[PDB]
Design a protein around this motif. Sequence first.
Motif, PDB file in Angstrom:
ATOM      1  N   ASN A  13       2.451   9.542  24.685  1.00  4.96           N
ATOM      2  CA  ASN A  13       3.533  10.343  23.986  1.00  4.96           C
ATOM      3  C   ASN A  13       3.147  11.136  22.939  1.00  4.96           C
ATOM      4  O   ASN A  13       3.374  12.399  22.857  1.00  4.96           O
ATOM      5  CB  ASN A  13       4.738   9.409  23.726  1.00  4.96           C
ATOM      6  CG  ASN A  13       5.409   8.764  24.938  1.00  4.96           C
ATOM      7  OD1 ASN A  13       5.339   9.567  26.045  1.00  4.96           O
ATOM      8  ND2 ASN A  13       6.040   7.661  24.719  1.00  4.96           N
ATOM      9  N   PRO A  14       2.748  10.463  21.865  1.00  7.67           N
ATOM     10  CA  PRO A  14       2.098  11.276  20.732  1.00  7.67           C
ATOM     11  C   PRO A  14       1.183  12.476  21.089  1.00  7.67           C
ATOM     12  O   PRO A  14       1.347  13.603  20.468  1.00  7.67           O
ATOM     13  CB  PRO A  14       1.308  10.082  19.729  1.00  7.67           C
ATOM     14  CG  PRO A  14       1.836   8.866  20.462  1.00  7.67           C
ATOM     15  CD  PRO A  14       2.216   8.976  21.764  1.00  7.67           C
ATOM     16  N   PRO A  15       0.174  12.452  21.819  1.00  7.84           N
ATOM     17  CA  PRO A  15      -0.427  13.565  22.571  1.00  7.84           C
ATOM     18  C   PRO A  15      -0.035  14.587  23.416  1.00  7.84           C
ATOM     19  O   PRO A  15       0.380  15.315  23.295  1.00  7.84           O
ATOM     20  CB  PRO A  15      -1.917  12.652  22.817  1.00  7.84           C
ATOM     21  CG  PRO A  15      -1.207  11.378  23.339  1.00  7.84           C
ATOM     22  CD  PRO A  15       0.281  11.176  22.834  1.00  7.84           C
ATOM     23  N   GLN A  16      -0.034  13.998  24.589  1.00 10.99           N
ATOM     24  CA  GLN A  16       0.506  14.417  25.911  1.00 10.99           C
ATOM     25  C   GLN A  16      -0.555  15.707  26.109  1.00 10.99           C
ATOM     26  O   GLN A  16      -1.045  16.588  25.369  1.00 10.99           O
ATOM     27  CB  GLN A  16       1.948  15.154  25.638  1.00 10.99           C
ATOM     28  CG  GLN A  16       2.878  13.927  25.533  1.00 10.99           C
ATOM     29  CD  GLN A  16       3.162  13.689  26.910  1.00 10.99           C
ATOM     30  OE1 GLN A  16       3.350  14.551  27.990  1.00 10.99           O
ATOM     31  NE2 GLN A  16       3.856  12.351  27.230  1.00 10.99           N
ATOM     32  N   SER A  17      -0.599  16.018  27.521  1.00  9.72           N
ATOM     33  CA  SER A  17      -1.537  16.919  27.748  1.00  9.72           C
ATOM     34  C   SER A  17      -1.147  18.404  27.467  1.00  9.72           C
ATOM     35  O   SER A  17      -0.093  18.943  27.765  1.00  9.72           O
ATOM     36  CB  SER A  17      -1.326  17.040  29.670  1.00  9.72           C
ATOM     37  OG  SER A  17      -0.343  17.422  29.985  1.00  9.72           O
ATOM     38  N   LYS A  18      -1.898  18.692  26.528  1.00  6.66           N
ATOM     39  CA  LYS A  18      -1.705  20.335  25.913  1.00  6.66           C
ATOM     40  C   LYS A  18      -1.904  21.267  26.633  1.00  6.66           C
ATOM     41  O   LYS A  18      -1.845  22.569  26.397  1.00  6.66           O
ATOM     42  CB  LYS A  18      -2.577  20.126  24.626  1.00  6.66           C
ATOM     43  CG  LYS A  18      -4.088  19.846  24.783  1.00  6.66           C
ATOM     44  CD  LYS A  18      -4.799  19.103  23.770  1.00  6.66           C
ATOM     45  CE  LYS A  18      -4.182  17.795  23.674  1.00  6.66           C
ATOM     46  NZ  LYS A  18      -4.747  16.815  22.906  1.00  6.66           N
ATOM     47  N   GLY A  19      -2.302  20.883  27.952  1.00  6.10           N
ATOM     48  CA  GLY A  19      -2.404  22.000  28.946  1.00  6.10           C
ATOM     49  C   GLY A  19      -3.682  22.745  28.729  1.00  6.10           C
ATOM     50  O   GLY A  19      -3.687  24.060  28.710  1.00  6.10           O
ATOM     51  N   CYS A  20      -4.861  22.394  28.118  1.00  3.61           N
ATOM     52  CA  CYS A  20      -5.898  23.004  27.622  1.00  3.61           C
ATOM     53  C   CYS A  20      -7.263  22.437  28.397  1.00  3.61           C
ATOM     54  O   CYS A  20      -7.574  21.344  28.564  1.00  3.61           O
ATOM     55  CB  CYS A  20      -6.247  22.704  26.325  1.00  3.61           C
ATOM     56  SG  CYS A  20      -7.808  23.448  25.419  1.00  3.61           S
ATOM     57  N   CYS A  21      -8.084  23.488  28.887  1.00  5.09           N
ATOM     58  CA  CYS A  21      -9.251  23.158  29.593  1.00  5.09           C
ATOM     59  C   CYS A  21     -10.344  24.062  29.312  1.00  5.09           C
ATOM     60  O   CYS A  21     -10.249  25.285  29.249  1.00  5.09           O
ATOM     61  CB  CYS A  21      -9.106  23.142  30.847  1.00  5.09           C
ATOM     62  SG  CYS A  21      -7.597  24.141  31.569  1.00  5.09           S
TER      63      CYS A  21
END
Length: 187
Positions: free
Chosen positions: A54-62
Amino acid sequence: MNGTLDHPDQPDLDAIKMFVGQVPRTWSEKDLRELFEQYGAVYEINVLRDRSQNPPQSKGCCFVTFYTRKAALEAQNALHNMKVLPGMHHPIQMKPADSEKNNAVEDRKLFIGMISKKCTENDIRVMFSSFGQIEECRILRGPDGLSRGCAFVTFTTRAMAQTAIKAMHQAQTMEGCSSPMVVKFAD
């Protein structure tokens, strides 16, 4: 065996690096690789998220690295520092090594609309030199016999560029040509 010689075959990082922001992430990592494969011969792909809690979550970065830089050239035409997607509800951003975009000039941009006809491009530099270090100086003038009245500038530090605004935007040439002057950072 296992060893990080850093250069087991390639003695140069002249390959290619890519950075993406806001990626669907609706699939898996391996599957995601396929998407990049359409641009050339991939090598290493890593997606950030951090245990997808929850604190992080996939920032959608690759970020992906290739082996055939020549192939990467095609990718540039496919996206480049600026890419546009349908916009329906599935936006993704792909850019290659922002650190060496090559278009670093765009990093700092200034736009001037109304300037005196008696202004040269390098002459403009002189005025901006009072502020600080300038990367590039540009002016637009027409063969009509004088400068149409527009200029473009690139400035090392944005803060320094902001100073120019106060010098122009907050001053105007109300003495030489008697007309408001507008200068603002590009967007």
